[PDB]
Amino acid sequence: TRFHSFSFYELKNVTNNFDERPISVGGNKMGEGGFGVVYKGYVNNTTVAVKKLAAMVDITTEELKQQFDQEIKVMAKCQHENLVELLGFSSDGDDLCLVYVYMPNGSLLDRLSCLDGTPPLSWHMRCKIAQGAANGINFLHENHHIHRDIKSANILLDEAFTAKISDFGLARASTVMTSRIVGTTAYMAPEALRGEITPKSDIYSFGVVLLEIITGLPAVDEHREPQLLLDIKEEIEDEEKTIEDYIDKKMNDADSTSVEAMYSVASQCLHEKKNKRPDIKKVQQLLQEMTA
Numbered sequence: 700t701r702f703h704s705f706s707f708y709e710l711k712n713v714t715n716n717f718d719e720r721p722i723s724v725g726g727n728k729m730g731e732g733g734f735g736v737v738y739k740g741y742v743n744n745t746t747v748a749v750k751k752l753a754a755m756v757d758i759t760t761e762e763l764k765q766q767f768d769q770e771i772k773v774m775a776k777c778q779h780e781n782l783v784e785l786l787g788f789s790s791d792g793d794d795l796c797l798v799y800v801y802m803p804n805g806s807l808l809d810r811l812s813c814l815d816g817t818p819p820l821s822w823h824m825r826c827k828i829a830q831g832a833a834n835g836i837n838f839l840h841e842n843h844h845i846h847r848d849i850k851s852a853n854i855l856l857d858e859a860f861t862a863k864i865s866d867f868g869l870a871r872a873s874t875v876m877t878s879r880i881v882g883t884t885a886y887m888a889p890e891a892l893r894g895e896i897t898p899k900s901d902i903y904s905f906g907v908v909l910l911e912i913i914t915g916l917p918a919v920d921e922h923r924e925p926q927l928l929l930d931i932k933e934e935i936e937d938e939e940k941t942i943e944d945y946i947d948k949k950m951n952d953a954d955s956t957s958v959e960a961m962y963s964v965a966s967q968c969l970h971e972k973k974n975k976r977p978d979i980k981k982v983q984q985l986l987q988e989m990t991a
């Protein structure tokens with residue numbers, strides 16, 4: 700797959716000169732991460748998401764360029780209904796830009812937090828999102844790709860709340876070790892925090908996502924006990940609590956049987972030993988069985 704090459708000035712123009720104000724006040728900024736800001740745009744008779752890369756954290760200009768290239772490379776090779784669609788990019792201008800099909804319902808992270816007053820996701824919608832995201836990860840793993848940044852902020856939701864895996868800047872082709880440890884701490888497997896590069900780490904991070912789906916709680920909350928959501932697995936196992944005590948109250952269609960079935964998948968994904976975790980095909984099978 701080869702992409703459209705956009706002019707920097709066309710992208711600057713359709714995003715109201717990269718307006719960093721929220722949508723609600725007439726701005727174009729929809730969200731931001733460590734490697735960039737995503738703006739709403741309208742190009743070639745289509746609402747788009749324009750990601751302008753900028754860091755914002757570490758970051759070598761070459762590192763950011765390597766993430767820009769990595770994202771285009773993964774998107775050229777990987778097209779799936781549970782992955783975001785890249786339309787094009789921009790290099791000619793000062794800032795590096797990535798153009799995608801606009802995701803009207805933004806990120807799973809924001810929908811779980813009901814950011815800006817959006818209604819809570821039903822359990823029925825949550826099951827479809829979990830299945831869809833697992834189908835997207837399966838496609839990446841089948842195509843020998845390791846995401847390395849699986850999190851609710853990197854699971855986007857379309858006009859039908861279909862799960863779309865996004866933000867492949869840190870993705871790697873396929874156990875190897877790295878001197879540059881990258882990812883989101885609260886979601887990272889212990890071996891990934893140590894430098895290991897394995898698809899087994901993506902499974903662990905997906906386990907954290909499944910806990911966010913069941914509970915509606917963020918992966919990390921400094922003003923909460925436990926601060927890290929993954930610690931709930933031990934509180935439940937050590938029988939101090941049950942998964943029912945953690946179920947998101949912002950749902951009226953969640954039955955205990957299917958919630959326990961999703962929790963069982965999350966628990967298995969969150970095994971501290973990488974080799975004891977299920978592979979993505981097993982995760983898919985179990986999530987499909989959950990709604991059958």
Ligand SMILES: Cn1cc(NC(=O)c2cnn3ccc(N[C@@H]4CCCC[C@@H]4N)nc23)c(C(F)(F)F)n1
Pocket residue numbers: 729730731732735736737747748750783784799800801802803804805806809852853854855865866
């Ligand atoms: C209403 N709304 C629409 C979007 N996003 C897109 O439409 C979009 C489409 N493809 N695509 C690809 C990457 C990407 N990355 C962002 C980066 C900031 C942190 C969140 C994401 N991981 N966003 C997108 C957003 C939000 F994600 F920024 F929150 N809100």
